[PDB]
Design a protein around this ligand. Structure first.
Ligand code: HEM
Ligand code: HEM
Lengths: 441, 441
């Protein structure tokens, strides 16, 4: 009944505990010591961190809890506006965009984004094919180039051309700077400058597109043509711009982090790498992978789910209680009380996953139906779950598959995992050498 | 632009492609091949089958399209007359009966039928309790005994006493024989004899009722006393008779089919059966269920909706274009042109439901507000939607809940699904053994 709580520092409460570069990892160690639920206080605030599937399945009951805008999400709203990621469920533009955009993010819709995803994946592979013997790969850096350019192309048919330069396109520079500043907030002149850089570019392409009348395979075309079935209204130009900025912010680092952690785990587990490589060789028989072929990369998909189990790259999400309620028969909550889902801890619940939780074993995803409800949530929950989940996984499966078809990989530095935390997680400094198998691309 | 259409064979048109007694199942396979819409021609006619949520949302626009009386409904009209189910929207009696009967079919109205529902549900449970050790249950047969008796009792306080008989009451024998003849038309003396059997008994019960002034908790009372708010008129005795026949023909096998498919899906999915049985045990704490308790059977309602998603028991309905119009911006239709809604195919639209559409998963319905509009239509559309929908769902939730409370079920023949098509769908020959939990009534 009494909720555990970590060390307090007078009026600062628990605040000094996340005055660290790695607060989620600090929170996992607190969860290790205190168990499935603890109270966390800051001067004006209170939360409860949840770690067990027991309590989190209740937190995911949408009749009882809804997505909360955490402080991080409120700072990101300064440039992400009322796009899907930073809106209350009850805001009109949340429901409008959700309704219009949902079918355009379905597994079926991936068929239409496939060609441009392939476009950028081929640019990454070709870069690595062109490296000289004396060179290596900076993995998260190249995966972020890849995901930024893919979401740019698929999002609004715009080419950042990240593989053509040392210094990113100025939008990306501003976007990264802006995101950086909002997290550090947990400067102002630069912040305002970088917001303008982003709106100016995105507003222009929207204007350009409406002028030309061109119809493309991108999300922008869907959004200009879409009408909310409920209200019958379309999105206005301003919200369309926030949705575009939102896809980039929410999708670029989560997805490149996934690809990075997956290649990390594969080079640290050569038997798993070989099984994955053998599937990729058998399935991707063409110089350019097809939509259907990506779907047949089942073990690669398990690899990615298992990397998501151990290091879900957007590792915590916030909820509020809709009404007074009791959590797991022991913890009374008041309307509006906040809950944080600590997803990496959820994914380490030995009562669900067995005792070998720290082991990288993709085979645990061999039978999806065998995973109990709400045990695996790297994409959040219910109607506020990641709308980009099919996009992220199709992208990552495509690219990792191509990586394994075309190269052998070496952990030439015997890399020691160092997890950098921002809004997302990634293995900082992860580097590898790739030797080409000289297969037609 | 041009509408897809399967191969034609000279003067036979597409007829050779439907050489089956299971045309909806065959049409679903043609839809898997040709997509969200196709034209289907036979020597006598032309129809267009719609399968996607996006085009069905348009066909559901009542200012553009209205309910069409298909040939089936026109043959049924020979004994169902101008009751709600077989009349055109523009008929005077349609609008009067609609206005008068609606409040008698509301969720609130179910409070008043609840006791009579429980009466027949207890008889079913007792039948099964009283079976000897080596006996088994004929599932559609017993559910149809149940729904016919429940609609008879709730509809005009008449007892068919189906659980006392091998051969049904003569009314039921003539009704189901008339129904069978109407569908086979797609004999004449028997058909006329069955019509007079049906008219005589119902006309006689109506006469007996007004000759006694007796007030009951049934629909006949409601129709004898109600007056259309719009015209101030009441229904006449002949129409009241057609509405009673109509409730029975429209509700008996749709509802019994639902109960049979749900039980099918539970015994083929033991873990789902267990979760539902656990809810039934937790909620049904009294010897007999209350109205309030049936309403709290959330997961049992989810099971029934998921059964309805996969095999909606009245699987297709027909519409006509009210005026010239263009469907989905690509397919021009003329006034009077017919559209068929292929509900099982609609319910397998992967842009809506995900790629996993053949899996039985009740949790799809955990948050009903989060299912897209017009995605789920087992009860038809708008003012011509199933008026019995609350009745059917209260009935099925109550009975399934009691089944799961009082018995364990064994699929002792490893039953192979065989879906018989008539006006409705049912798992023909579905057979089960129950082991009583010995919980007294
Ligand atoms: C492996 C990659 C990804 C992971 C781990 C991830 C994870 C998440 C999580 C945990 C949430 C819920 C946030 C909350 O509850 O506050 C979320 C929401 C969201 N993500 Fe993803 N995401 C990924 C990829 C993407 C991609 C590629 C896109 C865009 C193309 C994207 C767009 C969004 C959007 C728009 C939302 C909000 C949806 C709504 O509430 O309506 N994400 N994501
Ligand atoms: C799960 C069971 C049920 C299913 C799936 C079902 C489904 C349907 C559907 C699809 C329609 C529309 C037909 C069309 O457009 O041509 C319909 C209409 C109708 N149903 Fe139901 N039905 C069910 C139960 C009931 C019950 C229990 C009753 C009667 C007590 C009933 C009475 C009616 C009536 C009279 C109509 C005509 C309504 C009007 O047009 O005004 N149905 N049903």
């Amino acid at each position: 009944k009494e909720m555990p709580q970590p060390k307090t520092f007078g009026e600062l409460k628990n605040l000094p505990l996340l005055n660290t570069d790695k607060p989620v990892q600090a929170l996992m160690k607190i969860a290790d010591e205190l168990g499935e639920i603890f109270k966390f206080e800051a001067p004006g605030r209170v939360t409860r961190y949840l770690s067990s599937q027991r309590l989190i399945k209740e937190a995911c009951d949408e009749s009882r809890f809804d997505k909360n805008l955490s402080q991080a999400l409120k700072f990101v709203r300064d440039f992400a506006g009322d796009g899907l990621f930073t809106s209350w469920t009850h805001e009109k533009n949340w429901k409008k965009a959700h309704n219009i955009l949902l079918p355009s993010f379905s597994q079926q819709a991936m068929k239409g984004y496939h060609a441009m995803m392939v476009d950028i994946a081929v640019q990454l592979v070709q870069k690595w094919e062109r490296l000289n013997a004396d060179e290596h790969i900076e993995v998260p850096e190249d995966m972020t180039r890849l995901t930024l350019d893919t979401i740019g192309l698929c999002g609004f048919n715009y080419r950042f051309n990240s593989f053509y330069r040392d210094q990113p396109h100025p939008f990306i520079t501003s976007m990264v700077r802006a995101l950086d500043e909002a997290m550090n907030k947990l400067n102002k002149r630069q912040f305002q400058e970088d917001i303008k850089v982003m709106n100016d570019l995105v507003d222009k392409i929207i204007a350009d597109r409406k002028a030309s009348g061109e119809q493309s395979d991108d999300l922008l075309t869907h959004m200009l043509n879409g009408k909310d079935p409920e209200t019958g209204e379309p999105l206005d130009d301003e919200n369309i711009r926030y949705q575009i900025i939102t896809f980039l912010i929410a999708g670029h680092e989560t997805t490149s982090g996934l690809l990075s952690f997956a290649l990390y785990f594969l080079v640290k587990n050569p038997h798993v790498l070989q099984k994955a490589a053998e599937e990729a060789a058998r399935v991707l028989v063409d110089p350019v992978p097809s939509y259907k072929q990506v779907k047949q990369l089942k073990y690669v998909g398990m690899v990615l789910n298992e990397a998501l189990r151990l290091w879900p790259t957007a590792p915590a999400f916030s909820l509020y209680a809709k009404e007074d309620t009791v959590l797991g028969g022991e913890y009374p909550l008041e309307k509006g009380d906040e809950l944080m889902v600590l997803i990496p801890q959820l994914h380490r619940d030995k009562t669900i996953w067995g005792d070998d939780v720290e082991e990288f074993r993709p085979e645990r995803f061999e039978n999806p139906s065998a995973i109990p409800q709400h045990a695996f949530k790297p994409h959040g929950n219910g109607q506020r779950a990641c709308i980009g989940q099919q996009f992220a996984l199709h992208e990552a499966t495509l690219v990792l598959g191509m990586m394994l078809k075309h190269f052998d990989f070496e952990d030439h530095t015997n890399y020691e995992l160092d997890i950098k935390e921002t809004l997302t997680l990634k293995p900082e400094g992860f580097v590898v050498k790739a030797k080409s198998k000289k297969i037609p691309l």
